[PDB]
């Protein structure tokens, strides 16, 4: 079973898009009704178990292509829409709890909403990957939901975040480091899915070890990116990433030891296994330290180990082979340092699905824009 720590969904205040005197004629005033309802619908799906990617993809697409007229220019003369600052939007943040923050910037809405959509795909993926029944086509669905979420986040960070006039506030969802932390985690989680698959399809030990090593690295690299944050809100989540890094370094040494045993290097296989078991114990302690850290989102539990399955057997095969010049119990002669892993994954590495917002709705014309008439 897969267990993915989840921070809560962002929440927002309703927006009616009612400008009264500003808006004129059916066209413009009809656009404001569509935004009203598209945003309303898109906000409902977030909490709806019924909702699938096909439904979400359609809701978001609709709303964003309409909201895109508050950001982009229609003509290529001007750089940007004249409506950008017309509306005050209000949003909470994954790590900040009940406390919201407002900006009257349409771009602030685009990124907060787009962020939530991304956040949705990962939550949809985790419910899914949590099932015991989980099938192949469903596993692939999780792998994919994660790569989409990742590509969305990445796109916010790269092409969008730079445009906000309000400077980035540490701890808020809308700052660079934190979005980067989400992008990494998503890739990290897609690779876990692959690792389970590779262990189940009985793929080569070297392949698994490498993909496990690369995965632990993404987790370490994520935790690092969050190290700039204050402990209050970031502590539990960081304890989780630390936990996931240990878990997968355990797997790395475990499957790597098998590699070593096959190469007839006994003191090293033994040493690789001891570090695997050692890191797993570390991971269990962290899992305890994690369960006891207060912060955003509920705690999750791993359970469901396949690990000592594999471990018990490698330990059995190593000793059966290595008593010889090494065992039986008090061990000689074993390297003091754990065998260093620079392992390179040729298979399983996940990259984000490149994402882009829809162009401006066809409902947007120089005329229907001019029907707004600020003044």
């Amino acid at each position: 079973t897969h267990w993915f720590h989840r921070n809560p969904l962002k929440a927002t205040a309703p927006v009616s898009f009612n400008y009264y005197g500003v808006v004129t004629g059916p066209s413009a005033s009809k656009i404001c009704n569509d935004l009203r309802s598209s945003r309303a619908r898109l906000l409902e799906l977030f909490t709806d178990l019924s909702c699938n990617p096909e439904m979400m993809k359609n809701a978001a697409d609709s709303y964003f292509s309409l909201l895109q007229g508050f950001i982009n220019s229609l003509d290529e003369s001007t750089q940007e829409s004249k409506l950008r600052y017309i509306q005050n939007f209000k949003w909470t943040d994954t790590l900040q709890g009940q406390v919201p923050s407002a900006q009257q910037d349409a771009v602030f809405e685009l990124i907060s909403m787009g962020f939530n959509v991304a956040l949705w795909y990962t939550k949809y993926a985790s419910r899914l990957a949590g099932k015991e029944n989980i099938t192949e086509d469903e596993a692939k669905e999780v792998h994919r939901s994660l790569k989409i979420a990742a590509g969305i986040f990445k796109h916010l960070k790269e092409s969008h975040l730079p445009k906000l006039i309000t400077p980035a506030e540490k701890g808020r969802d809308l700052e660079s480091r934190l979005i980067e932390a989400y992008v990494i985690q998503c890739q990290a989680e897609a690779q876990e899915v692959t690792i389970a698959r590779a262990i189940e399809l009985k793929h080569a030990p070297g392949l698994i070890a490498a993909l496990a090593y690369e995965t632990a690295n993404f987790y370490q690299k994520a935790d690092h990116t969050l190290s700039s944050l204050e402990p209050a809100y970031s502590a539990k989540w960081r304890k989780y990433l630390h936990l996931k890094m240990c878990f997968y370094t355990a797997y790395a040494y475990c499957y790597h030891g098998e590699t070593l045993l096959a190469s007839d290097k006994c003191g090293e296989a033994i040493r690789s296994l001891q570090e695997a078991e050692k890191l797993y114990a570390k991971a269990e302690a962290l899992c305890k330290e994690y369960g006891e850290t207060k912060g955003p989102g509920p705690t999750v539990k791993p359970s469901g180990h396949l690990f000592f399955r594999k471990l018990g057997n490698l330990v059995k095969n190593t000793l059966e082979k290595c008593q010889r010049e090494n065992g039986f119990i008090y061990f000689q002669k074993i390297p003091t340092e754990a065998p260093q892993l620079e392992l390179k994954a040729n298979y399983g590495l996940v990259e984000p699905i490149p994402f882009e917002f829809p162009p401006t709705s066809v409902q947007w014309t120089p005329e229907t824009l001019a029907a707004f008439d600020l003044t």
Binding site: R197, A198, L201, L207, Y347, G348, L349, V350
Partner: peptide, 17 residues
């Protein structure tokens, strides 16, 4: 589907058995 090396790959990027 084949990676850069011409090896067949499944949807997950793993080789085909």
């Amino acid at each position: 589907t084949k990676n850069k090396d011409g090896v067949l790959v499944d949807e997950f990027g793993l080789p085909q058995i």
